[PDB]
């Protein structure tokens, strides 16, 4: 069925980097034309900013520009999120999203709460 596997909480040191393991699944009925668009969000409920966007990065918020990267393989269903140069401001929740088709998109509500420490 549809879903995403990632840790619920993750902690990193300011200045360092953080890697969030992530894997997603979708029904074998599966369509294959959308090229699967992966998108990570930050503060989905509040300001909801884009951390990455396989579609077009021009949609990525200036806050995460060049400070985040998708370490995955759609062909393996890997969505790992790499955070470069951590800062305290990076603390918060991250949620993944992927789209195979217009009416076949999914968002992980669990997300991953990232808290940057010293």
């Amino acid at each position: 069925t549809w879903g995403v596997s990632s840790p619920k909480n993750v902690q990193g040191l300011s200045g360092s980097c953080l890697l969030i393991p992530c894997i997603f699944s979708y029904p074998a009925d599966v369509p294959v034309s959308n090229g699967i668009t992966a998108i990570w969000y930050y503060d989905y409920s509040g300001k909801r900013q884009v951390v990455i966007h396989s579609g077009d990065p021009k949609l990525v918020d200036k806050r995460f520009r060049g400070r985040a990267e998708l370490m995955g393989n759609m062909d393996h269903k890997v969505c790992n999120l790499l955070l470069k140069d951590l800062k305290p401001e990076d603390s918060g929740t991250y949620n993944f999203r992927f789209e195979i088709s217009d009416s076949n998109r999914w968002l992980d509500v669990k997300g991953t709460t990232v808290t940057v420490t010293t």
Binding site: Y44, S45, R48, L107
Partner: peptide
């Protein structure tokens, strides 16, 4: 888009 809104 839909579902969650916003």
């Amino acid at each position: 888009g839909h579902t969650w809104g916003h």
